[PDB]
Design a protein around this ligand. Structure first.
Ligand code: 97N
Ligand code: YX7
Ligand code: CL
Ligand code: CL
Ligand code: CL
Length: 438
């Protein structure tokens, strides 16, 4: 062989410096020749380095593990795609137009279920003795099952429970017995909680311009959608199984083939005719190009394969960034035509700089009132009610402007600077009524 590609290393350094992720691990496969780029720190405080041993949360790239398991179960005749979900989760009643709806296993595999957006807030919150069927019971679907593609993370939590019901085994054990042990992915695992994982990267999240350590929720029921843990050597083996199925058992080979068959039975938009398969996006354009991003509150990742060209790309990072969600598109552009686009924008970054300006704008306002005021019973009670009256209005405001949304969800996904905005808003109300009391 020969050296790794330096134009390729520059791209990734640039994207990593843009995205401000503490650690970034990328692997690129092109017909056996793997290139590896392993940069940064898995833990910033201890200055613990990013190594090949570092473990990441895969985000939505967990769904291809879940979905392939479903396809193994189907291929062994222990399940059908058209089976009704209530056959396996019999307490899950899901409503469309007031009537219980028929949802097939296919409906959750391909996001044609109609679960509202707020099911992500419900599944991602830990609840110890609460099953998925009980958490979604009496949800009001957005459309008739099968009618539209609409991505909801929680559809793959429904499938986690379906695996658990069919096999009689826990989700961890089906993933191990069926995927990671037969493939050799000896460091990958579906977790059961926030128990201590050796070598896991610390997760970060933008706050006042810098990465801030964030301990994110890890709800057991949400692991089939968001919290399978893995490493770069193991995603390389993953990538390589999907690309070379000959050595694999015939059930795994067949299950894989049916895992890349996109659902063509949904409406398509004028600019998006990409299909969804069993945890993958399918694009015939400059393809087939099979891809999926990973996006957790404090990890992001991406994967993309171009099987006819023996190409696999995967990137892992311990911070949620769109520069990483797009990084596989960048690398595939580079491997295809030698050029790539400028880095896209990031929604957490724009929100953070907005909150910094608003925090300085709130902080400039209070100092004006305190300087002009200091230079110059009923007072204590009245000037304490108004800040608590705004604090009350602020607390109810999410669950009104967007039903099903709440501060707990805002805090989990937004910048660490969110909390400055209500606290700034209510603190500014106290100094003004105390000043208006003066
Ligand atoms: C006062 C208005 C904003 C309060 C935010 C809040 O109360 O945060 C919910 C808690 O669940 C944190 O996780
Ligand atoms: B997946 O689509 O990357 C999914 C994984 C998860 N944590 O459930 N992530 C999202 O859908 C991102 C939702 C952002 C909400 C503001
Ligand atoms: Cl089994
Ligand atoms: Cl257990
Ligand atoms: Cl092959």
């Amino acid at each position: 062989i020969g050296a790794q590609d330096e134009r390729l290393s520059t791209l990734i350094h640039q994207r990593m410096q843009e995205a401000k992720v503490p650690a970034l691990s990328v692997s690129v496969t092109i017909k056996g020749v793997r290139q590896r780029f392993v940069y940064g720190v898995a833990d910033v405080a201890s200055q613990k380095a990013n190594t090949l041993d570092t473990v990441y949360e895969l985000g939505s790239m967990s769904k291809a593990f879940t979905g392939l398991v479903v396809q193994i179960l189907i291929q062994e005749g222990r399940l059908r795609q058209g089976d009704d979900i209530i056959t396996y989760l019999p307490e899950m009643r899901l409503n469309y137009q007031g009537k219980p709806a028929s949802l097939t296993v296919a409906d959750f595999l391909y996001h044609t279920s109609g679960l509202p957006f707020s099911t992500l807030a419900r599944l991602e919150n830990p609840m110890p003795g609460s099953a998925v069927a009980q958490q979604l019971r009496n949800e009001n679907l957005l459309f008739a099952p099968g009618a539209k593609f609409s991505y909801a993370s929680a559809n793959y939590d429904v499938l986690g429970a379906v695996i658990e019901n069919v096999t009689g085994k826990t989700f961890t054990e089906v993933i191990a017995e069926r995927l990671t042990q037969p493939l050799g992915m000896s460091a990958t695992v579906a977790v059961k909680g926030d128990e201590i994982i050796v070598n896991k990267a610390s997760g970060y999240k933008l706050g006042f311009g810098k990465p801030v350590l964030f301990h994110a929720p890890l709800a057991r029921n949400h692991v089939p959608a968001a919290y399978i843990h893995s490493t770069l050597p193991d995603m390389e083996i993953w990538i390589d199984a999907w690309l070379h199925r000959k050595a694999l058992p015939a059930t795994l080979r067949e299950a894989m083939s049916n895992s890349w068959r996109g659902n063509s039975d949904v409406p398509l938009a004028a600019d998006n005719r990409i299909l969804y398969a069993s945890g993958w996006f399918i694009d015939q354009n400059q393809g087939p190009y099979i891809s999926h991003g990973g996006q957790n509150p404090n990890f992001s990742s991406c994967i993309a394969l171009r099987p006819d060209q023996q190409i696999g790309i995967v990137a892992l990072a311990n911070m949620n960034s769109n520069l990483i969600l797009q990084l596989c598109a960048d690398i595939d552009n580079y491997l295809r035509i030698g050029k790539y686009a400028d880095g896209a924008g990031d929604a957490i970054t724009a929100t953070d700089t907005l909150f910094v300006y608003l925090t300085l704008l709130l902080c400039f306002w209070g100092a004006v009132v305190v300087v002009r005021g200091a230079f110059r019973v009923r007072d204590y009670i009245i000037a304490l009610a108004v800040p608590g009256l705004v604090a009350a209005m602020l607390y109810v405001a999410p669950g009104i402007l967007s039903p099903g949304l709440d501060w707990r969800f805002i805090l989990v996904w937004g910048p660490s600077s969110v909390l400055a905005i209500p606290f700034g808003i209510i603190l500014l109300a106290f100094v003004l009524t105390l000043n208006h009391q003066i």
